[PDB]
Design a protein around this ligand. Structure first.
Ligand code: K
Ligand code: K
Ligand code: K
Ligand code: K
Ligand code: K
Ligand code: K
Ligand code: K
Ligand code: K
Ligand code: K
Ligand code: K
Ligand code: K
Ligand code: K
Ligand code: K
Ligand code: K
Ligand code: K
Ligand code: K
Ligand code: K
Ligand code: K
Ligand code: MG
Ligand code: MG
Ligand code: MG
Ligand code: MG
Ligand code: MG
Ligand code: MG
Ligand code: MG
Ligand code: MG
Ligand code: MG
Ligand code: MG
Ligand code: MG
Ligand code: MG
Ligand code: MG
Ligand code: MG
Ligand code: MG
Ligand code: MG
Ligand code: MG
Ligand code: MG
Ligand code: MG
Ligand code: MG
Ligand code: MG
Ligand code: MG
Ligand code: MG
Ligand code: MG
Ligand code: MG
Ligand code: MG
Ligand code: MG
Ligand code: MG
Ligand code: MG
Ligand code: MG
Ligand code: MG
Ligand code: MG
Ligand code: MG
Ligand code: MG
Ligand code: MG
Ligand code: MG
Ligand code: MG
Ligand code: MG
Ligand code: MG
Ligand code: MG
Ligand code: MG
Ligand code: MG
Ligand code: MG
Ligand code: MG
Ligand code: MG
Ligand code: MG
Ligand code: MG
Ligand code: MG
Ligand code: MG
Ligand code: MG
Ligand code: MG
Ligand code: MG
Ligand code: MG
Ligand code: MG
Ligand code: MG
Ligand code: MG
Lengths: 77, 93, 93, 45, 60
RNA sequence: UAAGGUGAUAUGAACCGUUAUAACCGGCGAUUUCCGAAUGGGGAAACCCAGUGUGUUUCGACACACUAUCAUUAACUGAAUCCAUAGGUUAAUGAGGCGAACCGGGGGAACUGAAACAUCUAAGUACCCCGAGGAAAAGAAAUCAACCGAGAUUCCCCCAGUAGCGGCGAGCGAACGGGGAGCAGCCCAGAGCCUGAAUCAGUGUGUGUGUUAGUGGAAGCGUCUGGAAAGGCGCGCGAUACAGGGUGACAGCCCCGUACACAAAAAUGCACAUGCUGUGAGCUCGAUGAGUAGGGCGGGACACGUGGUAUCCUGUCUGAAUAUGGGGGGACCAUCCUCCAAGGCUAAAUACUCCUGACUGACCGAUAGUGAACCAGUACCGUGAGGGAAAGGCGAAAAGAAC
RNA sequence: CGAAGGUGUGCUGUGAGGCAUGCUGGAGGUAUCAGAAGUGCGAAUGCUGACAUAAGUAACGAUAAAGCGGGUGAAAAGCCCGCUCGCCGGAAGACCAAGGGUUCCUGUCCAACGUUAAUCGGGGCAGGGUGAGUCGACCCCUAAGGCGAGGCCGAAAGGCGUAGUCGAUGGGAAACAGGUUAAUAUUCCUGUACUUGGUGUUACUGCGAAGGGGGGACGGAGAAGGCUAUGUUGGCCGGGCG
RNA sequence: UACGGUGCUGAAGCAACAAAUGCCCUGCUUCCAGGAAAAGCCUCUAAGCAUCAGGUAACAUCAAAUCGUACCCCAAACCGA
């Protein structure tokens, strides 16, 4: 599914609104990218499907802290 | 417990045989009794046979031979065991 | 080898009919009603043990029960198993 | 003339039988509805 | 007859069980032939088998 | 608990029992085929076919048990690849499926109304999906208020069809504040001193108190009509019992009950009591939730349709100060007041009834009331989902009509 | 010592109505004054049930066709038996699959069912009847296709698919003739066979798969030769002399 | 004969000719549109076992379960009330 493994961002629903205010249902998808993250503690690459936002979280917190959070949830990688 | 029992002498309170006496031959689970010589019917048996029809148990009373009248039954415990007694004179049946 | 408990439940009844009587006189074959789940091996063992005869062969069939009206309501008799048990020549059950 | 019902027990059972009903959520909902209604015969089986 | 059967051992109860099952077989054959007037014996033996099996299970 | 009994249509047969192992009722056990989550593999449900281990064999075979999947944990093992990791096998523990409503969440119509119709409405309704519990959710102020003060959440009555929103149309529609129901507060983000004091869970065991069978339970006769009396007439009696039902017509006193008084070997809910097991309170000193608040863009939620639009949520791009600090007070600024987000738990008042017991009705009485008073979700119809009836009354007693 | 309801009759009010009473009925009814409504039916091509009309009318379902004698019976155009006639005969015969499920056979019954009668029936009731190493299924094997551990994907539900595992309409061992029941028969019996596997006894001996190879293993059309099923005729045998 | 059907016994039982759309034939000839799969089966060895198991043939013996089997089936029994 289109779910960020770091943040849990997923598709949300809302409306397209025309100039005449016609509402049609749409989705907003996360900006997801499969990315190979270097885990220097483990000396290997871990691939995560992450939002661009999730990538900024990894930059801020570090991959070790993030993977520990994933292990606590039971999110496997 | 049942106030009327098989082999009790009873007197008929109600119906065509009111006042007649007889022995309880059989007690039915329907709340009826066969009383000997009471409530006779002529059955057309595939001969014409005379036999007792069941009577409502509330239409017979225990017959008190001492007073010579219909009586009511009560229950009490004498020496551990439950006994029946005549309400009129308090004597164990 | 079959346990005696099992053998005492497999044979249900002798089957009585003109075909059964003829089977006995002409072909030395007894016809039995047997348990629905009885095998030819179990029937053979049970006959040899309990009737004290020597069995040549067992043929079996399942009789499908008849659909029958009792008053208005529809019912169905049970299926049952018939065994044609051929005895050896000089057994004489 | 050839009418619409051309019976085949194999096709009957594969299309509508108990195991066909059990194979999908929507088939299991059929069985749930029929049990709730109190049907004597849940399926064609 | 559970009080009497409870005095026995597993060996004796197993002996008693086969005796009852043999009796049950013989009565069944008599009943099928129409030489059993006493139909009440069928229930008696059936319930006796149940008693022995109950007590064997209790001791097991 | 008992003098009767072996469920019904449904008689019979063959029996069992009467002072206690007949039957019946209740507690606790035993047994509990096959299908079905169905779980050893398969399968057109109620069937077909195995493996492994044990035990027993009359050598033909037989019996019993285990063997699904996923998750977590552990052990043994183990690639590309050196270490390793992936992977493999076994073990333990848990899950799975079903269920009427209520509850939280993920999605989410249209008819319709606007006397057309697109904004708007219907409506976050119907419906689909996920998850839970006896309730759920919410909850201990970055809340309101207005310079006076209040003091978590929830529910009810007001405020008020008001203020507002609105093709300012149709419609939508608060809050502040007041009256009530109920009431309760805590913990982590951490070291120290100190003992394990507070109190919540699992497992006990006495003490009550209910639940699951039961026990006793008052007092009426005569006469008239009649097929029959419980009715009429006469004269009595009980009542902490004249609730109700039955009995050959309408019975306080014929029967079953009722008021009232009692009862449990066994299992069990609850409430306190004191153990054991884990849990640690108190105090001083310190700490105080960042890709967050806020912003830009798009949308959604707020009664509030972008409007002069505060506040909340966030798909996307960004991005603080962190108590000498920060949030809010309906554009915005200043002043003043008030609160402390980015961690969490928490009873009660509230919602509902598949189901169990008791009781009630200016509710129905067989075309009514459930579709169904009756062997009805049946017969019957349909490939299927699904649809779906009709049909009650002899008599007091079968005395159901011998001949 | 006769309630409601039903059905008559009489009286009565301006009306909706009311009162009385005979018969039926056989256990309920309810003044008055108030109170509440599922409160009044002729229509809605209204709804359900009952019953009319047309009408003893149309029709009795292939124009293959009947006739007679005897039987049984309450009764015979229809059943049974017989003789004759007619109809089908690449079927209107015979055997099956599919589908149905006792309709099969025997006895008994004729209400209903059978477009008539019915003694008859696929109708009612009862009893009987389906016998396998070799036929088929199950089973081994796969096709299309289905499901699918992990996996990849998807708001949820789910979608796809690997290893696998299912799935015949296809591939895979073996039985024939005769006889027999009211009703089964390549299943029973008689005679004569065959297949696969397990165990043991003897002999000789490289056996061993989840792998390799072979095989299984495949089209349309056409042509002709060799055959058999089968038929015809003769011979033979039995019977015939119209 | 219980007139439905049984019992008893039983001769000849050969040849010629004709002849399939059936068999030889999953053949042969020919054509283009170029005609399943997998197992059983045969054979080869690997790891392995190694004078043991296993293989091969004859001989003997045991096993071959379970379910279907009635009846209609171009039809009065199936699909069409
Ligand atoms: K609309
Ligand atoms: K309109
Ligand atoms: K009286
Ligand atoms: K009475
Ligand atoms: K009473
Ligand atoms: K932001
Ligand atoms: K401030
Ligand atoms: K109805
Ligand atoms: K009247
Ligand atoms: K009144
Ligand atoms: K009308
Ligand atoms: K007419
Ligand atoms: K006629
Ligand atoms: K077979
Ligand atoms: K099988
Ligand atoms: K002539
Ligand atoms: K057959
Ligand atoms: K067929
Ligand atoms: Mg819309
Ligand atoms: Mg045989
Ligand atoms: Mg068979
Ligand atoms: Mg399974
Ligand atoms: Mg299984
Ligand atoms: Mg399998
Ligand atoms: Mg409109
Ligand atoms: Mg619960
Ligand atoms: Mg909660
Ligand atoms: Mg202040
Ligand atoms: Mg009592
Ligand atoms: Mg009393
Ligand atoms: Mg009466
Ligand atoms: Mg904070
Ligand atoms: Mg804010
Ligand atoms: Mg923001
Ligand atoms: Mg803003
Ligand atoms: Mg914005
Ligand atoms: Mg918006
Ligand atoms: Mg505006
Ligand atoms: Mg502000
Ligand atoms: Mg927030
Ligand atoms: Mg009704
Ligand atoms: Mg009526
Ligand atoms: Mg049907
Ligand atoms: Mg009655
Ligand atoms: Mg009335
Ligand atoms: Mg009148
Ligand atoms: Mg009305
Ligand atoms: Mg009318
Ligand atoms: Mg009108
Ligand atoms: Mg008409
Ligand atoms: Mg006319
Ligand atoms: Mg005419
Ligand atoms: Mg005519
Ligand atoms: Mg005709
Ligand atoms: Mg004639
Ligand atoms: Mg004719
Ligand atoms: Mg004829
Ligand atoms: Mg029938
Ligand atoms: Mg017939
Ligand atoms: Mg007729
Ligand atoms: Mg007639
Ligand atoms: Mg018939
Ligand atoms: Mg075969
Ligand atoms: Mg496939
Ligand atoms: Mg798939
Ligand atoms: Mg999966
Ligand atoms: Mg397969
Ligand atoms: Mg096939
Ligand atoms: Mg036949
Ligand atoms: Mg060809
Ligand atoms: Mg020839
Ligand atoms: Mg001659
Ligand atoms: Mg041809
Ligand atoms: Mg046949």
């Amino acid at each position: 599914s289109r779910v960020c493994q770091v943040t849990g961002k997923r598709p949300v629903t809302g409306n397209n609104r025309s100039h005449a205010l016609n509402a049609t249902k749409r989705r907003f998808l996360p900006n997801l990218h499969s990315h190979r993250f270097w885990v220097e503690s483990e000396k290997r690459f871990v691939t995560l499907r992450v939002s661009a936002k999730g990538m900024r979280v990894i930059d801020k917190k570090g991959i070790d802290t993030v993977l520990a959070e994933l292990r606590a949830r039971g999110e496997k990688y | 417990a049942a106030k009327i029992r098989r082999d009790d002498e009873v007197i008929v309170l109600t119906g065509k045989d009111k006042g007649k006496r007889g022995k309880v031959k059989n007690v039915l689970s329907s709340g009826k009794v066969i009383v000997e010589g009471i409530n006779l019917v002529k059955k057309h048996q595939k001969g014409i046979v005379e036999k007792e029809a069941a009577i409502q148990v509330s239409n017979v009373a225990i017959f008190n031979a001492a007073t010579g009248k219909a009586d009511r039954v009560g229950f009490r415990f004498e020496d551990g065991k439950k006994v029946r007694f005549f309400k009129s004179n308090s004597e164990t049946i | 080898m079959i346990r005696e408990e099992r053998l005492l439940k497999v044979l249900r009844a002798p089957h009585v009919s003109e075909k059964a009587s003829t089977a006995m006189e002409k072909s030395n074959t007894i016809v039995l009603k047997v348990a629905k789940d009885a095998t030819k091996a179990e029937i053979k063992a049970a006959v040899q043990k309990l009737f004290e005869v020597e069995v040549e062969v067992v043929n079996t069939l399942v009789v499908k029960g008849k659909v029958k009206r009792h008053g208005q309501r529809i019912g169905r008799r049970s299926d049952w198993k018939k065994a044609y048990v051929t005895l050896k020549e000089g057994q004489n059950l | 003339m050839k009418r619409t019902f051309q019976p085949s027990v194999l096709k009957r059972n594969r299309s509508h039988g108990f195991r066909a009903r059990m194979a999908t959520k929507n088939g299991r909902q059929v069985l749930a509805r029929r049990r709730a209604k109190g049907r004597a015969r849940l399926t064609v089986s | 007859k559970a009080k009497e059967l409870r005095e026995k051992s597993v060996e004796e109860l197993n002996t008693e069980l086969l005796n009852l099952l043999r009796e049950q077989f013989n009565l069944r054959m008599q009943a099928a032939s129409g030489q059993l007037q006493q139909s009440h014996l069928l229930k008696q033996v059936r319930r006796d088998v149940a008693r022995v099996k109950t007590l064997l299970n209790e001791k097991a």
